[PDB]
Amino acid sequence: TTEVITSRIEPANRYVAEKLRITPGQDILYLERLRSIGDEKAMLIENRINIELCPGIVEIDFNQHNLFPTIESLSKRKIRYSESRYAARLIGNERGHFLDISEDAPVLHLEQLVFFSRELPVEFGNVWLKGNKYYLG
Amino acid sequence: TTEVITSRIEPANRYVAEKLRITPGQDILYLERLRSIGDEKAMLIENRINIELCPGIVEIDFNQHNLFPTIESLSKRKIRYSESRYAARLIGNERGHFLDISEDAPVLHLEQLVFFSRELPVEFGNVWLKGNKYYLG
Numbered sequence: 001t002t003e004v005i006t007s008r009i010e011p012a013n014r015y016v017a018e019k020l021r022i023t024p025g026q027d028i029l030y031l032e033r034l035r036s037i038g039d040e041k042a043m044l045i046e047n048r049i050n051i052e053l054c055p056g057i058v059e060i061d062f063n064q065h066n067l068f069p070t071i072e073s074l075s076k077r078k079i080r081y082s083e084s085r086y087a088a089r090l091i092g093n094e095r096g097h098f099l100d101i102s103e104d105a106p107v108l109h110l111e112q113l114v115f116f117s118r119e120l121p122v123e124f125g126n127v128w129l130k131g132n133k134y135y136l137g
Numbered sequence: 138t139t140e141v142i143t144s145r146i147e148p149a150n151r152y153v154a155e156k157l158r159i160t161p162g163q164d165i166l167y168l169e170r171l172r173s174i175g176d177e178k179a180m181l182i183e184n185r186i187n188i189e190l191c192p193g194i195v196e197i198d199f200n201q202h203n204l205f206p207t208i209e210s211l212s213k214r215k216i217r218y219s220e221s222r223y224a225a226r227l228i229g230n231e232r233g234h235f236l237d238i239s240e241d242a243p244v245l246h247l248e249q250l251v252f253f254s255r256e257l258p259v260e261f262g263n264v265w266l267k268g269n270k271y272y273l274g
Contacts (some may be wrong), residue, residue: 002274035274045274068273082221082272114273125274135219135272136205136251137139137172137182137262 002035004062005098019113019124020050027051029058034098044098044128053122071122081115084135091128099130108133139172141199142235156250156261157187164188166195171235181235181265190259208259218252221272228265236267245270
């Protein structure tokens with residue numbers, strides 16, 4: 001199970017804009033999603049999506065649709081590449097609350113950049129994994 | 138469940154050597170692993186591992202140990218980056234047999250390069266996924 005906690009259209013900050021190769025300040029879609037595995041909360045996902053590439057994405061209910069299939073349909077583009085970077089973090093109070101983790105608990109943090117083509121990023125995700133690596137394999 | 142089908146020490150071919158940034162011909166460990174999800178076969182994984190970075194890895198039974206945790210223990214290095222590239226393929230006869238797919242069926246093919254540091258790759262995997270993207274998110 002993945003449930004949408006919140007969404008928002010927000011201006012891309014400089015870091016996010018650099019990752020997505022867009023102009024700082026350009027509106028992007030922010031999605032926060034809580035993924036649970038067997039009715040235990042696995043991970044907290046914060047997706048930031050370049051909406052210029054997928055006309056209509058802001059109107060989707062992602063409690064009812066899957067994110068990446070929807071990106072692909074609306075763009076009529078295939079996802080061809082991914083990069084991830086893995087780091088230790090100490091979750092935080094608010095994120096903590098979503099995952100139960102004790103605030104200040106250490107979690108695996110992943111940043112992932114998702115591309116249609118080598119030169120066209122579409123989505124930049126931050127993942128808070130309270131368990132153990134598994135984007136590998 | 139993941140089960141080891143086979144393993145082999147083999148010389149790195151030019152493509153694999155370039156991915157792993159090693160000298161063509163250098164011995165690497167090849168592992169073929171079949172991952173099943175709930176007693177249905179999910180994916181076929183072929184890992185190729187630079188053994189110079191993990192003294193002892195060739196002696197492990199990965200029916201009894203997890204691959205990436207073991208890479209990390211033996212190297213005393215953390216995995217910090219991943220890149221994947223996704224492509225459509227038509228499985229093949231022998232791979233087909235491992236996944237049941239009809240030979241010549243189309244599957245999602247992933248190549249994934251796993252790094253300790255930006256300049257030090259450790260593993261180059263080919264994954265045959267007969268279902269649908271999910272390294273994303």
